[PDB]
Design an enzyme around this catalytic site. Structure first.
Site, PDB file in Angstrom:
ATOM      1  N   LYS A  40      15.060  16.619  22.416  1.00  0.00           N
ATOM      2  CA  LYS A  40      15.594  16.354  21.202  1.00  0.00           C
ATOM      3  C   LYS A  40      15.062  18.292  20.464  1.00  0.00           C
ATOM      4  O   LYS A  40      15.132  19.328  20.301  1.00  0.00           O
ATOM      5  CB  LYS A  40      15.358  16.114  20.666  1.00  0.00           C
ATOM      6  N   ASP A  57       5.037  -4.761 -12.770  1.00  0.00           N
ATOM      7  CA  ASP A  57       4.152  -6.050 -11.660  1.00  0.00           C
ATOM      8  C   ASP A  57       3.177  -6.422 -12.214  1.00  0.00           C
ATOM      9  O   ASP A  57       2.400  -4.973 -13.079  1.00  0.00           O
ATOM     10  CB  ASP A  57       4.156  -5.170 -10.066  1.00  0.00           C
TER      11      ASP A  57
HETATM   12 MN   LIG Z   1       4.454  -1.450  -8.752  1.00  0.00          MN
END
Ligand SMILES: [Mn+2]
Ligand SMILES: [Mn+2]
Ligand code: NA
Ligand code: NA
Length: 327
Positions: free
Chosen positions: A64, A248
């Site tokens: 490649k 979060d």
């Molecule tokens: Mn996060």
DNA sequence: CATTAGA
DNA sequence: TCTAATGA
């Protein structure tokens, strides 16, 4: 870094493809170490063979390499790039909650587009439903200006919930960044540490409050120590409603707060570099502690950390403001 | 590298 | 139970 650029980048293109479109963990793994190796090499790869001398580089990749050097291209990359099925998997995968595995199935069934996704909301779980719902907002960066209003709100309720609560918006925002991707709050309480058999409500009380006041608008996942949702700042005295952002919030044994805090504040490099230093300095740093090294090869014994400092100090370094934790 | 959903 | 998906 630039000398093996295309090479590694082609390599990564290929790697990545084996992993998602095809379910070939191996090749995918192949493409990557080689990519990893040609990447280190000090000189300009001038051919298959040269590269070939490398570890991980076999005949397949060397091959490649030539074609890529030869013609500034690769057929396989052109084909894949074209290839609708793979294109699809590459794209579906963008929906929060959709991984390659699911991406395959959807396509199988023939779900290639966002609309396809829509006409079939049912085949999708909650996560995905939500991810599809705010596909637009999720894709957008979080302007710091807003990061300041979010951080603002979050810290208030936190305190208003219990005062003995310690929160810290970690991440790039913490370290200066003009914009952030999602918001990461690190949480802790004195009442929670290494032993003290938990207090789930700890995380729980919080989400409830934030939702109460209308900041958290959805939940991707809520467990006993890691909450994962969607928030949004109050679309003002209207005209401008805000985008849906990812949030979060995670609970931490107060006795590992800073290590964690240290950690999530990154960057990936500083971390490493820092981590690399504690090693010589006779230590070890991980996402939660900092252990004095022993001569037998290893050793343990978690040193007491009260602030990012202690950590610093321990490894006997210069306290670095978040701003300059860049590397 | 560990936490949650889900089936 | 394991298997996926997030993050970081
Ligand atoms: Mn996060
Ligand atoms: Mn983040
Ligand atoms: Na996704
Ligand atoms: Na297995």
């Amino acid at each position: 870094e630039t000398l093996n650029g295309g090479i590694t980048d082609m390599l990564t293109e290929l790697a990545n493809f084996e992993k998602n479109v095809s379910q070939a963990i191996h090749k995918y793994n192949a493409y990557r170490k080689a990519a990893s190796v040609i990447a280190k090499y000090p000189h300009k790869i001038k051919s298959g063979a040269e590269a070939k001398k490398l570890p991980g580089v076999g005949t397949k990749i060397a091959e490649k390499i030539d074609e890529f050097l030869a013609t500034g291209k690769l057929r396989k990359l052109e084909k894949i790039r074209q290839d609708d099925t793979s294109s699809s998997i590459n794209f579906l995968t963008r929906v929060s909650g959709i991984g390659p595995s699911a991406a395959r199935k959807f396509v199988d069934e023939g779900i290639k587009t966002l609309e396809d996704l829509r006409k079939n909301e049912d085949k999708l779980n909650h996560h995905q439903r939500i991810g599809l719902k705010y596909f637009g907002d999720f894709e957008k960066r979080i302007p710091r200006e807003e990061m300041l209003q979010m951080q603002d709100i979050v810290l208030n309720e936190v305190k208003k919930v219990d005062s003995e609560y310690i929160a810290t918006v970690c991440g790039s925002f913490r370290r200066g960044a003009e914009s952030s991707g999602d918001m990461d709050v690190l949480l802790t309480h004195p009442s929670f540490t290494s032993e003290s058999t938990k207090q789930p409500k700890l995380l729980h009380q919080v989400v409830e409050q934030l939702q109460k006041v209308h900041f958290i608008t959805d939940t991707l996942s809520k467990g006993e120590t890691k909450f994962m949702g969607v928030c949004q700042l109050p679309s003002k005295n209207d005209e401008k409603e805000y985008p849906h952002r990812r949030i979060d919030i995670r609970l931490i044994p107060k006795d590992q707060y800073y290590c964690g805090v240290l950690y999530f504040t990154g960057s990936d490099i500083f971390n490493k570099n820092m981590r690399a230093h504690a090693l010589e300095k006779g230590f070890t740093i991980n996402e939660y502690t900092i252990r004095p090294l022993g001569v037998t090869g290893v050793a343990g014994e978690p040193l007491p950390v009260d602030s990012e400092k202690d950590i610093f100090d321990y490894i006997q370094w210069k306290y670095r403001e978040p701003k300059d934790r860049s590397e």
